[PDB]
């Protein structure tokens, strides 16, 4: 039946591998609490050491489910088998369920806090599938579902940047701001999730959401040679190379050597030319993408009217550690420990470089723009990467290849928003008084993954991801990677190869 | 199914625009508590500084839903689009739902108060659609549903004026009052909402109410010229003007000038002649509508046996600030801050004046009564106005045009009354003892709005409501109008045009 | 007699919308990021490895294309544009400058914010207008997909990149056309072309 | 019927707004005269102050209708309403008529 | 929140007698031209867009 | 703008005139090398021969 004593779902988990598809199933226990005391608020974060960088933030009384990472949908076993056995994969269909909800009242009698459920209390659930509201999720956020199925998932408050602050900040000689800055505030949108229709559930209820992906494949393959090596060294070429007079060397006309043939295929795009600009508390990137309408007043540097573009490097080989993708494996990691620095996948469509001859030597071209006949592989994503990102709605765009490796889509999976229904309290003083409550429940995500198995005429063995590439750590230093410790600590991958990137194992004939 | 752990509704919100209709959807979380300790009481409010003004008030153990304002049914975005894109609109159908009810018991153990729900407790809901009881709502009350969907709605106690007090007050030389005043008390009606059949709901239940409007349109259009300018200046007129002898000027007979033709259309009605009478604690209006049967004893002035008629001015141009419509934007506003003074809509069917020649000059006619051939536009309502008012049941009436702009109807939307069901407590002393409880729940209002799009042969652009007409305020003074502040404070419109009145944007050929 | 002519358009939309934020602001400031920023040693400042601040997240979306680097070349009676697109086959004799074997490319600026009045779209409203009267200078639409800029850090400050070519992951809005604009233009017949986005706003 | 004293058309004008389409109608009185005395000619414009810039121009005994601007198809009222009420627009079908010739 | 729209209040006044508003005819019959770019009513101004 | 120079919307196609060939003729001599240089490799040569 249905009621308070009947569960609305069950635990779903594991994976199913087939030839043409993989089904991953993940359930988590999540917790949500009241945010902003049921208020919408617009705050200005303006760090003193932020070197003039600022944000406007509308914080909402809402929290949201973020499913975007690979590690949350794949065990390390399943990710290994995925990247070892398949040439490519993409998401096919997502199904998420929120069920087994429990709304407890929080009673503070003192230092001791007690918990008893309000059976008539309720919870708001809203999935935004048309992206009618500012997107909650962003790639590489820590809000994502946990990797370990038995770890609790704590939802993060939803907030959005209503405006670019330095454009709206009403600073300058004139009082009240310039005419252009005021015009940019006079229209600053304000979004409330309460403006949409959505669901209110009690403990005996549940909700489910389906999403259909239509996506480009994630290709797991490596180029064993660059596109320039695709010729045959033994056959001569008809091509002639003329070399102009250089100093005392006479100009010559000769047949190009058989072992260097000319290539038609350029280095992929990328920027090696920029450099990060401290301090670390500002936005530090080799490149800022800025918007600066005419008539605004800017008292800061490029950071703070613009966003840092990172990784700047494309398929180009990073010439410095600043250009490499890097992330901390846990939220408690700081400094040089817990960080994973990306290393080459040893694919020959990656780590490209472009040199121009000055007729003496070749010198590196740092900034490689889009140019015809460019051939490159997209970034070698690992088990920890964002799966997707939100593609901005715009008139025009170039080739969409986010350098972090996430897949940009017009409509990604919609964000499911959840908040505690407000339970007002009588107040003789007309104060705003609500009952303190929280919801815990079980959220499951089933994703169907369309996959393709490789076929190779290669005679020789190929690289595969092996547990022998794992490292040993822990409190007692006996615990291998992706295993729990004596304290229950989950041993994180130390290095980029332990994250099992794609575009490593399976060779590819160009 | 149905029960304590199953929600009886969901959150509905937003708007839907079409050509011939607009659907607005609004849900609020409301709270109600016990009123008058479950008693009916008749109180006499007789302020010492009220300058002899008094009221009889029957206060009831009831609270009521008030949906009458435009701002509660329209976001400022939706109101803008309504008044920019449509020549006229009226309400079509209302649907309200009370659901997701929670009755909590209030436990006071000390300075600390605890809240736990009584699942078998219940709540009375009564909609009066025949207006069999004194109307709860009145235009420009603060009891109305909030503008922000996430703000809690606190219901107000229902009460009504049983009688005009100075007529019933039994004052005079004779003891016990005159014969006429006693006769006016001997019949003073007394109304109990318990006399009607109505619904009692528990948490697992819900109720809904439908109402069908049949209304006059709210016309959003402006006259670019007065009705007197409707002639052609270049064609001569046949009309003759005779001017009698004035002093040493000889009487003349001549053809009226082509650029002044006579008009058939009089100034609309209005009173510029009255003045408010202090102090502010009495009823201060330029005009009192009084009832004074013969045989009553009146020891006071006109105020207190009568009601102030405000705005006194009709379509007539207010000659003083006293004659202008004015309101505070929030309940905490006092004095000169937070008040919005109405300003001209620059429609030429508004701000009318009437002068009579004394044969030397023209002098203003202050009081313009109904006269044949009068042409005027009804008040330019804003997003904050009452939508409707209750029209009194009476034998005879003149043209119904409330000067505040609210639409008078024989039957407006019925008032939904709600109170906490009394939960008596055993008392050995035969005291009246009840259990202290309150109800919070979700109330939704869907209104279908019949609309009409304008068509114009005007070549030139027309005025529209723009966000660039908004102003910037807040604690940090960075927050634009209709946006939330850092504290969560909602920035109120400072001026009358920011309230986006009608009869401004869309020109009209007379 | 009389004649009539019908034509059927198949066209891209003219989009009337504004971005209230740039594509770089699409994150949530309150949630932390996993991303690490390594800053190399600069002078006496030590190299540091730290978590990127929550209020600056890295963006995947580059500034749209444009040229801020060129400048018009007088006199006004020649072809004066920041850029000449020229054709110069081998064997021709050219006794002139770049103007006159080539055509001026104007507006040079893309979605990039014009850094000078030369880069702004400008026209006279009537055929009799001359000089500084009757001219309409384009001003920002206050859309955040317009007026873009690109800076590269030298590890001390950020310096403007004047010429922004096509680069992957670029996001921009097409020019904010007005009631006086060409609706369409003729697209040249050619083998190859890049993204077609005439900077005046006309639809090729 | 048809002849010298029968008009071949009428004045069409205005706009019609709907949800999914807008119809703009514009009629003009046009004038054309003889060009180049009925000759094709190839002229070289080579301004002395043109700083070496020149053009070859084939001028024809022909004139042409140019409909390409937005302001010619939209009144300022209609353009306002277009840009206020709609997120996007594109041309769908054009129909032009030359008639009432003298 | 409300959004920007094109308004006749953004027009300017000019003419021979300087009484004629934009997009209106003058005493001579001269049609008053838009002085500034916003009076030409550009697109990508009024209607906000969620990216 | 003069009637005989109108602004053009159409840019020059792509190309590289900036590079120069690097002798001797027995090596790979081109104005530009497209190279692949993964991190951790050892290169004792110039751009030619890893590209």
Author numbering:
A (entry chain A), B (entry chain B): 33 to 542
C (entry chain I): 237 to 440
D (entry chain I): 33 to 134
E (entry chain I): 492 to 542
F (entry chain G): 288 to 338
Sentences from the paper on this structure:
3D image reconstruction of 168,565 GBoV1 WT and 218,746 GBoV1 VP3-only capsids resulted in structures with an estimated resolution of 2.76 Å for both types of capsids based on an FSC threshold of 0.143. The GBoV1 capsid structures were identical, despite being assembled from different VP compositions. They share the conserved features of the Parvoviridae subfamily, with a channel at the 5-fold symmetry axis, protrusions around the 3-fold axis, the 2/5-fold wall, located between the depressions at the 2- and 5-fold axes and depressions at the 2-fold as well as around the 5-fold axis. The basket-like structure beneath the 5-fold channel previously reported within the capsids of HBoV1-HBoV4 and BPV, was less pronounced in GBoV1 suggesting less order at the N-terminus of the VP. In both the GBoV1 structures, excluding residues 1–32, residue 33 to the last C-terminal residue, aa542 (VP3 numbering), were structurally ordered and models could be built into the cryo-reconstructed density maps. The GBoV1 VP3 structure conserved the parvovirus features, including the eight-stranded β-barrel motif, α-helix A and β-strand A. The structure also featured α-helix B, a region unique to the bocaparvoviruses and the ten defined VRs, VR-I to VRVIIIB and VR-IX. In addition to the high-resolution WT structure, the structures of two capsid-antibody complex structures are reported, highlighting antigenic epitopes on the GBoV1 capsid surface. Both, GBoV1 and HBoV1 share a high sequence and structural identity, with major structural differences localized to VR-I, VR-III and VR-V. VR-I and VR-III are both part of the 2/5-fold wall of the capsid and VR-V is located on the protrusions around the icosahedral 3-fold. The 15C6 epitope lines the 5-fold channel, encompassing the residues that form VR-II (residues 142-GAD-144) and VR-VIIIB (residues 460-STNA-463), which are the DE and HI loops, respectively. The 12C1 epitope sits on the protrusions around the 3-fold axis and contains contact residues from VR-I (80-SNGN-83), VR-IV (276-IRQNGQTTA-284) and VR-VIII (390-NQTT-393).
Gorilla bocavirus 1 (GBoV1) is a member of the genus Bocaparvovirus in the Parvoviridae that contain single-stranded DNA (ssDNA) packaging viruses. The structural proteins that form the viral capsid, VP1, VP2 and VP3, are encoded by the cap gene. Sixty copies of VP1, VP2 and VP3 assemble one T = 1 icosahedral capsid in an approximate 1:1:10 ratio in 2-, 3-, 5-related symmetries. GBoV1 is an alternative to HBoV1, as it is capable of also infecting the apical side of pHAE efficiently, package 5.5 kb and less susceptible to neutralization by pooled intravenous immunoglobulin (IVIgs).
